[PDB]
Amino acid sequence: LVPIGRGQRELIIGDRQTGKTAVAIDAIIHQKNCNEQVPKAQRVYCVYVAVGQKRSTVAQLVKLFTQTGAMRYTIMVSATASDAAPLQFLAPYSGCAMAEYFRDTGKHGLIIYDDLSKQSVAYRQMSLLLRRPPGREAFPG
Amino acid sequence: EILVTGIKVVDLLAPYQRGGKIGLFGGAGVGKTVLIMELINNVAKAHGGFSVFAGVGERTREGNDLYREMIESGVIKLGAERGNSKCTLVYGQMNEPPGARARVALTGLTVAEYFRDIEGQDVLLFVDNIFRFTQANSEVSALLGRIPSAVGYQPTLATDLGGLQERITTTTKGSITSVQAVYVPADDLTDPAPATTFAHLDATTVLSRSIAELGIYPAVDPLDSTSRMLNPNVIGAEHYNVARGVQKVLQDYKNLQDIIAILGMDELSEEDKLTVARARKIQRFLSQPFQVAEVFTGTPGKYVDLADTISGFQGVLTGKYDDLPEMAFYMVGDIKEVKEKADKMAKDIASRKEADNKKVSEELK
Amino acid sequence: ILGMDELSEEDKLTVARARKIQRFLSQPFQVAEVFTGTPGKYVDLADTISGF
Amino acid sequence: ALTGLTVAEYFRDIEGQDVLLFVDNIFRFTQANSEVSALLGRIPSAVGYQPTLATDLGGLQERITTTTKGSITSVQAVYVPADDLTDPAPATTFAHLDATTVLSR
Amino acid sequence: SIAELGIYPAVDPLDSTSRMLNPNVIGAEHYNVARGVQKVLQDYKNLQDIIA
Amino acid sequence: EAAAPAGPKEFTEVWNKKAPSTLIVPEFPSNYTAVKAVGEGQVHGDAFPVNFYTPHSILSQAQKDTVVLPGVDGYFGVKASHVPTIAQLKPGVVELHSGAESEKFFVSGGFAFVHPNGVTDICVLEAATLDQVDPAAVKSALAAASAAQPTDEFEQAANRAAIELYSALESAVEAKA
Amino acid sequence: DVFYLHSRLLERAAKLSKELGGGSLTAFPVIETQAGDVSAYIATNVISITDGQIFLETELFYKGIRPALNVGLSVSRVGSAAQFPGMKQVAGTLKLELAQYREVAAFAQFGSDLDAATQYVLERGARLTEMLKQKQFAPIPIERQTVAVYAATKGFLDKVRVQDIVAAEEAVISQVNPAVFKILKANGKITPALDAHLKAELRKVKLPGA
Amino acid sequence: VGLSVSRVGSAAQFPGMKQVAGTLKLELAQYREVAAFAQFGSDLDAATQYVLERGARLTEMLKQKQFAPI
Amino acid sequence: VGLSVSRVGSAAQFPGMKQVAGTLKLELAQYREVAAFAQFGSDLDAATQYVLERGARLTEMLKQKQFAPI
Amino acid sequence: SNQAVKQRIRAIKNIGKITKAMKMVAASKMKNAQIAVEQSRGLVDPFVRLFGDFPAVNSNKSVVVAVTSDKGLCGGLNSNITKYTRATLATTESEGKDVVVVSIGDKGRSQLTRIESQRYQLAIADTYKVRVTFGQASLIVEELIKHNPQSYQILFNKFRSAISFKPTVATILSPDLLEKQLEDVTGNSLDAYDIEASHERSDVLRDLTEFHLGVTLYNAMLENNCSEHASRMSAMENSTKSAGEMLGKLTLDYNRKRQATITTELIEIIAGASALM
Ligand SMILES: Nc1ncnc2c1ncn2[C@@H]1O[C@H](COP(=O)(O)OP(=O)(O)OP(=O)(O)O)[C@@H](O)[C@H]1O
Ligand SMILES: Nc1ncnc2c1ncn2[C@@H]1O[C@H](COP(=O)(O)OP(=O)(O)O)[C@@H](O)[C@H]1O
Ligand SMILES: [Mg+2]
Ligand SMILES: [Mg+2]
User: What positions does the entry give for ATP 3 binding (chain E) (predicted)?
Assistant: First the structure.
């Protein structure tokens, strides 16, 4: 129904506990299933950016990825909820810089910014505590 | 690993993990203290380890009530037999200033963290209203000189709540089974303080105001409560399929809710009037009498085992109880007790016409 | 939607009382007799209670 | 409205009479005080009214009373904004009203 | 709403406006078929609620 | 022999035992019928109650003293206590009498019962009084009827009904008294 | 801190221990809602502070039912242990009969139809409703309340029409001899010696109408 | 399905799925077209009842489990 | 028509229009309250169908082309 | 957000207007189709005065007719008749007999072909499309004596009042099969009548029971049509009061969200201005 492409940014939007992380995980697991099959340059290297999630969920996700063998191609950037708000703000950029290595060197990357609705709350925390004037829902400009 | 609580809507539709964070979301008078006292009654007795109760910004009446009901239960022993006590109370109740309510959850967590890390134990951490932690930081941050974020909360809401909630974990050397009550501030689940703490929980048990206005207690919303244990690879497919079937029937009745209002049930399809009657049955069958609610209702409590709920909810789904009335399912434990209430409703419509009771010759007795 | 003919005799007696009750709530004012001719009435409370 | 209350308060407190006071649109009194407190730099309360809405209304409505020498009765035209009786300006004004005369078309 | 019916381009025929839609500008024959299409579409938009 | 007595009283017990007990027992047209046949009465002398009926209208429900009905064996008068009969009617004029004055409805067919309690029941599908018929149409309609005779004898049954009704109507319009 | 404003005020209404004199303090905060909305900020604040509630409905109040207590939404679970016994005996079947009366709400023959077998609970819940109506500035002693609701809920006012239960219950209070009120207040419960003399006193009174 | 869009559409999916998926995308639009006309039960001329099972079979075809990509 | 007011009102209109428009706004109000029945097949009691056709020709009476005042 | 509840208020408001129009449409249709019902009530009683009322007969082939309505906003009428249809159809089936079930009105065919599809041979709709007339009931009755049953049970709603619609069962016995036999007591009860017809009584009773089936079928669909309009007049009344209670609740919810929106937008503006001032 909604087919992705190879350089496409596709938003997984929904309410809580509807299966957004699940769609992203099936994308990463399917890329492990197809990387063992294609000649060396159609292989997709995944990056999971886990912003704002609890550390138990990231442990469950690393357990799942390593028991299915998908951790061989996956990087996981994990700025959890107890981390400082600049680490949660900066972890999508860290993960994108890790996954841009494969884009810049002829390979193919795939990145999931899981809970990008939490990077904005961490950025709002930083900008309100740096005394920058708030806006819509007190988010920065 | 699953933690059976003996509550039907909790066991079936959002089962509790034995070492995970558990939230009870409620809206001021829907029953999340009675639910947490029933979880203390059903869980903390069969648990062999230690319990901590962090009372964060709740009634001091309830703190004295829990203390006295724990002394007469033998869970707290006074004086010389104090070493055999199983529970630690930490109380920062709603008369305390906001600096005390904002740090008393950390006190309860520290007492539980000692038993987790040092003693190697399994701990239960009940926190009554973890919302009042957030609210107390919101009270003190108006004077700390910060620019406020959305609805009026501090700009550091999520990192405050996350730095508190990331300490309540099962580690490699101990487990904290934490049941937290969360207050939603104006029956608003989109308020930032409930919406922030949805992310740190394994099982959310969202209690509804309208379900309580129906009279169905505990007022757990079956289509707003979730769990990471509702998965066939942990609870088995026979439990998972009946839970997803019950949720499917309750959603397919919720989709008819305004057609039934503005037109009535008179015009619905006969494959959908079956759906409405079955869902009116399985939403009375989630009702359950509690052992802690028997003091103000009088009906005794019903602990229901898990296999009883799974078999009793297969039966209403397949159609094995389409002849029993709706009210036969209300406030009963098992599907067995539906049958002894269905026929007791049919004695008492026939016992109206049996006798004419008069009392004679007792003025000299 | 039905008609006054199908009404009960007590469901026409309330109509016959209520029409003259809402007519008896009307009153000609003293400040309108400048340009409407009918003189104005000041009704006491004792007359009002008995007359209703 | 306070000027009108003063001219009525003479006839109450000095003449010893039963005075009427017609405050035409008590809502426009509320709205004018909302504008005044917005110009003085104060933070608005709920929907946009003054924080002092209850006490600015109660400064007017509490001098309209019966004392030992006379009384002031007050027939106040009430505007209800957005057909909303729970709007805080008619919700505050209705707390002081002792009667209600609805004129219908 | 037009695009959820699969009709592309999803131009709202009512909510679109032009300064050229004037009988002195594009001609009265064009103007009347435009106003007639908008008339029948507004009538159907008002009838959908009693159809359902 | 009546050892199997069907009825409204004897449907109720088999219904109360077989059908569900939520429902009240379904009504019957006997419950809405105030006057009957076998139970006597309704004459009190020279009067007898005549109920002249059509599916669209109730033409008379008063009491009369004689009615003359166009039976298949010819006309016949029904006085206050006739013998009980079930008389099939042919097209003709039903005439009511209450005394000196009479009303004459021309009918198209039907039956006519008089019951052992003296109540009579005239049951016809269409009864138009003689003022409502114009004679210029019945002559041309009989001319168009007594002319075309198809061999399909269903249509000749309809033709026989046509010429019977139209002929009795034509004799019914020169028969003014 | 508008929650703390009310919480630090209402927490001072306590029942002290026996080491502290045994004194108490009962609080009745009053909260005005707008259009019956109890999901307001302050209303949900004080609901989550106070022990019970007394919801007063505008629909019942403008239907003549005064005190207009919403009997389903109103709770008090702390003072339910501290009830007058005897009143606790009859109030159970009182609010159970009113509870199954609230299942006959807006569809007696308003909603779709009538079954007319539950006319007993309809014309019983009406008499229990007009039993609980009460005028202003006249509070009733508890022993005369439990006698009145005993006469209501045991069926001793079952023959009286709905229009004069206000007169029927004051006739019950004025006509039943005032010894039984002293027995009921001193014993504090409807003792097995007392229900017999109560039921003997309740059949020999002339209730108006009928 | 009605609210989830994609900008590339074709030219960036499987060609064999491109043969068999346009007739699924439009047929689910037909199936959603009749869901607001399924509360009465008139069942017009075996069309609004035929796609009422055909699209209902397609939406059941699109369901799948978790952690098990195909 | 129902939401457009003029608080000056009839004191400042054409006196030849004032005795004709007082009927017009009244029967336009009558047409506005009976406005659902225009879309019906079952005709009602012809005290409503009369005001339906009358109000329809009255709303078509008040139409006017642009830049051509009367 | 705050636009969906506004258009939802508009939708409920127009639904309330629609159902208040349909209520008085059904009121007009009940007020005119009531005199036809009282006029057709006369002809059914000479036959039940002559032949009587024998519901509990033992037959071997029986045609049961459920007279339903065509349009589907009747509010609990056609479901009531398909309850009573099988409630009397199981009452009189204990002999191992044949049963043909017929429905008048396609809301009977939507409700009877799932509850007795083994016995359902006929579905007759569009009967009320203009009006019901006696020739129409005659054609339907001829389709009923296409089969040759021993009895006819007719299920319809008698228009008792504008609020009460008593569901009745009317029974017609076949002439040579049960009509002469259910009158036999001490001889026969029909022998008191002197037949003044052309042929023998086995044809007079044939004509009379065909007439009696047609007459009670005419009155059946006519009474049921009047009660269908009178129950639609009450169902649309309940629909207006339900869509008025829903509008009155949703307007309060809109006013709450309106006040909340003005407050939170103003708090956003003040918070953005206090950071700079
Ligand atoms: N295809 C599926 N089939 C069955 N169950 C599923 C499917 N996808 C997800 N789930 C279940 O739904 C629940 C929510 O899934 P997931 O965590 O992916 O959603 P989410 O939106 O990321 O939630 P959160 O916002 O809490 O992170 C999980 O418990 C998962 O077991
Ligand atoms: N399981 C239950 N059974 C019966 N009544 C209940 C139940 N849960 C809640 N209630 C009612 O709802 C009220 C809510 O009490 P509480 O749990 O203290 O609310 P909160 O959610 O504010 O802590 C109780 O007084 C009780 O009367
Ligand atoms: Mg997620
Ligand atoms: Mg609490």
Answer: 19, 22
